Write a protein that binds this ligand. Structure first.
Ligand SMILES: O=C(c1c2ccccc2cc2ccccc12)N1CCC(N2CCC[C@@H](C(=O)N3CCOCC3)C2)CC1
Ligand SMILES: O=C(c1c2ccccc2cc2ccccc12)N1CCC(N2CCC[C@@H](C(=O)N3CCOCC3)C2)CC1
Lengths: 750, 748
């Protein structure tokens, strides 16, 4: 019963004027975004986008159907979508939930809450991404309207109402109507020898008025917490997100906020009324882009709903079809065999340029290539914690999370507090190559988030340590520093940490990143022109090469300081000669000392080389930036494949040792390829070529076959050994579905 | 050795304002004595301990030998001490730096001991106590080269023209080449051959980047330890760098007063910053900062009282991570009433928890909710809007979260490094979550969940602090963390809205039962309140001026009489304008009065009555009886979860629908269907569980094992018909000769 002229036109106008998109016009928007991503009419596949509406049936379960648009029994709609993308030409599935803002200002009733619940639950059922379009007014609020205009007031003094009232009540005739409906609890009182029904509680005939709504928020709040742990969650904020709306967005983490919009818990109109003054001017003042985009809650901003949708697909580009598929590697137009044109220097630079490249400064149309595949690097949480840069990219078409360090002094404009006229906007300096509380957090968030995308991670390490002065310590830098340790510990994909040219990893920043946090996943590489150590060289000298040592160094190298020999060696004691040289030696001491300190600092530095890193087995290999792209490509591409064989199958069958499994994989290489060819196992490329002989009579799967079969041998032997009572009744179970021919085989054996 | 080693090293420790590492065991004994009260109340062998020691193959071997002689800057003991809740003993692994070894620095060997000792703590599921007195990762240089290198100057007789490179003579290089101490390229400077230092490696191990590695290792270990076992930490002198990160990664931390937790010291920062900004290390990481920011859970005046807190904290916690929370027979009887009465006006939450000195009495105590003396607070000075700690209800240990109702004043300190910033005083409203109350709340929830404790939230929140500064300050992030924390909770969570307490809006949402329906039970006091908005706000939206007017038309005789007069329109404009004026007069008079009646009408929706009808709460409760009621419900819920989660779940893997129905169905079998209603009685149920299980007891549980094991094997054969006929003929080994004829006819 939904009419196009009547229902459709008006509802879209109603979303149009709210500055949002009517919920049933999003599927079509997704169709249009994909068409752009494919770049033409002549490059477009058959069914770019298939969808189906998820609809709650009479017993609160979802049922796929594709009725016409509109006509939804709750103010939320869900769709199961499939769309042919470049990473998945034969399709990838996805679930989109979103408020019908036209329906009761997008309020959250128990019915709405339920659909979102089942939609989310299903998404997790199939391990596929959950897109949520936030356009709402938070939990629904209501009263007992029925009873609102029945109740009478027992005044303390009917002449003077400034003197208040005793209670509220209903007369017997009033109560008789509402009696059986159990709308109202009230104690039968007999004031003035007259019968009244003194209200004690008000329930309401109608459902979805109060506390039930709050529970129903927490329910979908909870669900949304779990889903962030299990599947991909992306969220689009278009008109507004309030309270339960806001919390849903945030629990999903990844958030695309449209500019007009806001993300609030309590609106300015409200806050003004509680506080008592005109404190806040707008809802955009509280939770608009210029707050959330700048504090990390919103990962990225978009100018309109369409660029939202487009980013959603743009994000899903890097991420696996589901939470049991691998990351979509695509054939790159950007060559792996090339060099990186952009070189990072002792001159401070935007780390974006080394990642994504930049326009060639000394040329017209030329581009300076960065480390990643041209055009692939897409940043998130940019204006927050600008001391670190986080985002995703592609290396030879392999998707990957990126973590880079800013090397220019950053400034941050913390805004003045509107509930405090004794405050103003402050600007705060932030040093390059330093973890602050905000960078520490952002860095840990990126790690937490990317891990959930099953993405591999590339950290371009260049940190001198954590900020450690009072304010930053007070501001809990230590807590967030420790989450970097928590985050990498729990990572389950390859992490490649790489110190670039003229970059450095010093002290506590090395500690929270070191390979031994996650031996199975982390590999640490230093550039030929990088540095690393506990302290900086100046500091090492300050502690471990002090003045006493410096004068000794003089006593050795500097020939002039053989005044010392002249001093002590020959026995001659005169106030003249003995006191003369005594001051004259000090003379030279003073002249040489600052320059020997400069030597001392160089001596310190020569300890901090990648030369020594490799020697003390802390980094895997020493690289060269020009040819680092291609090295890390084949290494990344191998590690992904080794990881597939091991976890996916080998561990999903043998349940055997990780040290053991590495061996058993190499054991197979040497076994079929020969001992004479064994050395090549250390060559990344050749190993990838050999791996596809098995993965893509499979030398490797024929082995996994034998493992998983022999594994179920020991599994049934353990139970029957543990539980000899079952064995007898068990043989008859296996006999029901054995084999009529082999049934006699057994039937005669024992 | 005794005088030389012991007296010296003790003086050496003394002068650094801390205890010698080997003297700690005796403090634990001395602490234990104070914990037991009188010497008559002592137990047999109060403390037993062995030292853990690395062997030739880097593995911990227990031994008992003379103190001193630790061959690495780190020491650790395995201790068994007898406590009140564990009279026959409980185990822990103590581990700490030797500040007297090498400024208490961390080298690879020091790291390895920590690694192995923590690994062991996790292996055995037992707590890991960590004593911090250190100086972060060890730093060193290739001394050998230090004493051998030469400088190739730009000009010999004026070294201020600088130097080209450093180098070794070919002679000197032939002493070193075997040792791999230094890498260098050959070079000729005016026909003299020189070996130009390119890299310096060092003969002696443990100089630089390898120490960071070894730090990163025990950080990773520490990070995991917090997930598996209880982890406590005491900073006695200073924890530096890696030492600061271990202390933090283990979360629960006791800081002695003049000590500090830092990364880079005040000295270093001053040089780097360019002026003498910081006067002390305490200024960066002393009690005054770390206690006020959540890093330090509690502060102590000395080591002894520090060791005591360790015992005092462990007293709430289970002996290992596969044992249940230690209930002890209470002295404060379970059946009394709570004498403190939460007021409509603000009060100190702690009073309703711990009780207070009777204001109108001589030496009387006003009882609180929990056992007397039993509530101990953590993170007191930080995020004071919320209160976190541990208490006991009838001897049942339990994590505690309570809300502040008075106004809070946080005295944020001036950053010496910023010439502009002077100190400030921030007011923080009560009954409100802030970026810190939220953080503290979820931080308490995660800490306590790892102790395997039950949680008790005496909820009293009007909502999250909205508004710009708090929203800019990421309140929305930490608010979400409360959801995650209760979602992941694995013990019982009892939420009680006490008398004159309220639970509103987003504060309801992030604390609801549906977040974790297997653990969270919600209760509202008879005089408590709850709902979407405050009544003042409900009225602002759903009971507006036009509507207040409609009420007056209905229910005000004066007002109603005025209308009646204008209802006979046959009068002069004088009378028409007058009565119009009068009626406006009357509605202006009444609007503030009717606003009050409208808020009260709104308020009658927010009642615990309604919560119960709409099923958001499990029961309405009365503060006097609150203590006794919850005690039995907690005790029941614990036993139920004990049988269920431990015993019952080990057998089958079915849903919790059976586990509940089945547990009850068993009760109704052994106790009759007439006596079925008592399943709703907590005490009868507690009595029942003990008298049967602890003292279909494990006959029904046994029967679960067969149908489960068979089920398991079925799926494997369903999955792999490959295995079928090899297993069937492997199983001709297992079946009996008499059982053979049993099956041979049964199958043929
Ligand atoms: O190596 C030294 C060091 C010196 C470094 C440079 C010049 C002089 C130094 C003198 C030192 C003296 C003693 C120990 C270490 C020293 N460090 C001292 C400073 C250490 N911090 C690393 C982290 C970033 C910096 C830092 O914490 N800041 C920078 C931002 O504001 C907060 C304070 C410096 C790095 C280690
Ligand atoms: O119900 C109302 C509400 C009013 C409450 C009390 C007095 C006047 C109110 C007026 C309202 C008007 C419109 C909607 C809701 C209103 N609330 C709106 C504000 C909500 N916040 C709860 C959290 C604490 C408060 C808050 O955010 N503050 C607390 C003090 O610090 C600054 C920020 C307000 C609580 C719910």
């Amino acid at each position: 019963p939904y009419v196009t002229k009547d229902l459709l036109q008006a509802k879209r106008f109603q979303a149009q004027t709210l500055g949002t998109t009517y919920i049933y016009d999003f599927p079509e928007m997704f169709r249009q975004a994909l068409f752009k991503l494919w770049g033409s009419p002549d490059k477009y596949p058959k069914d770019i986008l298939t969808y189906t509406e998820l609809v709650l049936d009479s017993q609160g379960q979802l049922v796929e159907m594709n009725r016409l648009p509109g006509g939804n029994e709750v103010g939320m709609v869900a769709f199961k979508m499939r769309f042919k993308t470049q990473e998945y030409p034969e399709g990838r599935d996805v679930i989109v939930i979103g408020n019908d803002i036209t329906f009761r200002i997008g309020s959250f009733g128990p019915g709405e809450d339920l659909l979102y619940l089942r939609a989310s639950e299903m998404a997790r059922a199939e391990g596929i991404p959950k897109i949520y379009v936030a356009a709402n007014s938070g939990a629904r609020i209501g009263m007992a309207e029925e009873i609102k205009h029945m109740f009478h007031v027992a005044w303390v003094d009917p002449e003077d109402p400034h003197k208040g009232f005793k209670y509220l009540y209903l007369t017997p005739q009033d109560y008789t109507r509402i009696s059986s409906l159990n709308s109202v609890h009230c104690k039968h009182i007999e004031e003035g020898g007259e019968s009244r029904y003194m209200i004690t509680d008000i329930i309401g005939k109608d459902d979805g008025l109060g506390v039930e709504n709050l529970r129903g928020s927490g329910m979908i709040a909870g669900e949304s917490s779990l889903a962030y742990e299990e599947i991909v969650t992306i969220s689009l904020v278009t008109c507004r997100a309030i309270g339960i709306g806001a919390y849903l967005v945030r629990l999903g983490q990844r958030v695309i906020q449209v500019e007009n919009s806001h993300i609030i818990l309590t609106g300015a109109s409200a806050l003004n009324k509680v506080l008592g003054r005109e404190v806040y001017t707008s809802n955009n003042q509280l939770g608009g882009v210029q707050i959330m985009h700048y504090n990390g809650v919103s990962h990225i901003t978009v100018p309109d709903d369409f660029e939202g949708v487009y980013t959603i697909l743009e994000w899903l580009s890097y991420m696996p079809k589901d939470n049991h598929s691998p990351v979509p590697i695509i054939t790159p137009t950007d060559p792996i065999d090339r060099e990186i044109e952009f070189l990072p220097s002792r001159a401070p630079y935007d780390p974006r340029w080394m990642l994504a490249g930049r326009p060639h400064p000394t040329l017209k149309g030329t581009w300076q290539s960065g480390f990643f595949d041209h055009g692939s690097f897409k940043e998130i949480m940019a204006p927050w914690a600008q001391t670190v840069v986080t985002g995703r990219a592609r290396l030879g078409g392999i998707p990957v999370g990126v973590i880079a360090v800013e090397t220019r002094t950053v400034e941050v404009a913390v805004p003045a507090d509107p509930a405090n006229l004794d405050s103003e906007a402050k600007i705060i300096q932030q040093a390059g190559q330093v973890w602050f509380p905000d960078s520490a957090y952002k860095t840990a968030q990126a790690i937490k988030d990317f891990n959930r995308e099953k993405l591999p991670l590339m950290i371009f390490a260049n940190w001198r340590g954590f900020s450690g002065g009072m304010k930053d310590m007070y501001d809990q830098v230590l807590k967030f520093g420790a989450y970097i340790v928590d985050g990498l510990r729990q990572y389950k994909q390859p992490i490649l940490i790489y110190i670039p040219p003229y970059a450095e990893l010093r002290g506590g920043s090395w500690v929270v990143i070191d390979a031994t946090i996650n031996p199975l996943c982390i590999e640490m590489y230093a550039d030929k022109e990088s540095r690393g150590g506990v302290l900086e060289p100046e500091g090492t000298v300050e502690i471990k090469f002090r003045k006493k040592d410096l004068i000794k160094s003089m006593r050795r190298i500097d020939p002039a300081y053989k005044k010392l020999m002249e001093q002590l060696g020959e026995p001659d004691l005169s106030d003249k000669d003995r006191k003369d040289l005594e001051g004259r030696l000090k003379a030279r001491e003073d002249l040489l000392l600052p320059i020997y300190h400069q030597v001392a600092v160089q001596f310190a530095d020569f300890h901090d080389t990648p030369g020594r890193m490799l020697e003390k087995g802390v980094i895997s290999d020493i690289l060269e930036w020009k040819t680092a792209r291609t090295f890390l490509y084949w290494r990344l591409r191998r590690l992904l494949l080794e990881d597939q064989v091991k976890q996916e199958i080998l561990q999903a069958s043998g349940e055997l040792s990780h040290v053991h499994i590495q061996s058993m994989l190499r054991r197979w290489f040497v076994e079929t390829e020969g001992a004479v060819k064994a050395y090549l196992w250390d060559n990344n490329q050749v190993v990838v070529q050999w791996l596809e002989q098995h993965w893509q009579r499979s030398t490797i799967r024929e082995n996994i076959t034998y493992l998983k079969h022999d594994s179920v041998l020991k599994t049934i032997r353990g139970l029957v050994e543990e539980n000899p009572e079952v064995a007898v009744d068990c043989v008859i179970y296996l006999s029901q579905h054995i084999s009529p021919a082999e049934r006699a085989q057994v039937v005669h054996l024992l």
